[PDB]
Amino acid sequence: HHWGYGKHNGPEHWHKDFPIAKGERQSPVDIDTHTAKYDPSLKPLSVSYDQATSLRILNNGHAFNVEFDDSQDKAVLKGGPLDGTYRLIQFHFHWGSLDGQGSEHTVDKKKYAAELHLVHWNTKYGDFGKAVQQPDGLAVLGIFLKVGSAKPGLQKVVDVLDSIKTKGKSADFTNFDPRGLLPESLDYWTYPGSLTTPPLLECVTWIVLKEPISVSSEQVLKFRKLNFNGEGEPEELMVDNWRPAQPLKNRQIKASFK
Numbered sequence: 001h002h003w004g005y006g007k008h009n010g011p012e013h014w015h016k017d018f019p020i021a022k023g024e025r026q027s028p029v030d031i032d033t034h035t036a037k038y039d040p041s042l043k044p045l046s047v048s049y050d051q052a053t054s055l056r057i058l059n060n061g062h063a064f065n066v067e068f069d070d071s072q073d074k075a076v077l078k079g080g081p082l083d084g085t086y087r088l089i090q091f092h093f094h095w096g097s098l099d100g101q102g103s104e105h106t107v108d109k110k111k112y113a114a115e116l117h118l119v120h121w122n123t124k125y126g127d128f129g130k131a132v133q134q135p136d137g138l139a140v141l142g143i144f145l146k147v148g149s150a151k152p153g154l155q156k157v158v159d160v161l162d163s164i165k166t167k168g169k170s171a172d173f174t175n176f177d178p179r180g181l182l183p184e185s186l187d188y189w190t191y192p193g194s195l196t197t198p199p200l201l202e203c204v205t206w207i208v209l210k211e212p213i214s215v216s217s218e219q220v221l222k223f224r225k226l227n228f229n230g231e232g233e234p235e236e237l238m239v240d241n242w243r244p245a246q247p248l249k250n251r252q253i254k255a256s257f258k
């Protein structure tokens with residue numbers, strides 16, 4: 001019926017209901033490292049997640065989102081290529097059916113096992129809904145996940161997946177510290193883009209970290225046990241919930257490092 005990642009309702013069909021899919025600043029894109037422009041005027045990123053308040057985790061039929069209380073400047077992102085304070089509202093992942101695919105952004109055509117998106121909205125706009133009507137309304141921090149050693153800080157997320165196996169299910173998920181998902185370095189690439197899922201709105205200053213975090217095979221395997229379907233419907237494993245790379249067109253990807 002509506003949108004998804006299957007053969008009959010996947011990314012290639014999105015343009016029919018969301019014409020912006022063929023827009024000028026669509027995401028994700030391939031990051032050509034030799035064409036990215038080192039911009040020495042970019043400030044370092046400033047991630048202030050010490051007061052973060054996670055509230056819930058839910059399976060929305062497309063991915064699982066961990067939501068945060070964004071009623072106050074509790075967990076924010078500023079600095080980098082951003083002007084203003086962006087508030088963390090939630091994070092989710094995109095992953096594949098196999099270790100060699102899953103990320104949305106690619107680096108020199110290399111695909112990672114998954115990609116974490118920490119979604120933030122520009123506070124000057126009042127609420128998330130208004131931010132999605134502005135060219136600089138959102139800032140998504142993207143982090144690549146490669147399969148290797150286990151990420152301790154990701155385990156609490158992994159263990160709770162059993163209780164939100166199907167579409168629509170949710171579970172209280174308090175006291176989760178998102179700082180446990182950050183890599184060691186905050187070096188990044190940035191470019192103007194969009195939401196990678198419908199409505200595909202062209203807001204979003206993408207901030208993709210250079211350094212991937214590593215998770216274990218067992219950790220990513222639990223992601224693959226989730227379902228796209230609701231309880232009582234035919235089981236469809238939630239895998240490959242990623243959108244292929246879009247044409248860069250008239251945009252330049254800047255890097256904070258050389």
Ligand SMILES: NS(=O)(=O)c1ccc(C(=O)NCc2c(F)c(F)c(F)c(F)c2F)cc1
Nearest residue numbers: 117119128129132140194195196197199201
């Ligand atoms: N993969 S990603 O690029 O990081 C991405 C992040 C967030 C969303 C999303 O929040 N959809 C919900 C949503 C909207 F996109 C709205 F524009 C809106 F007004 C809403 F109320 C709403 F719930 C979609 C894709």
Ligand SMILES: [Hg+2]
Nearest residue numbers: 133134202203
């Ligand atoms: Hg917009």
Ligand SMILES: [Zn+2]
Nearest residue numbers: 092094117196
């Ligand atoms: Zn995403």
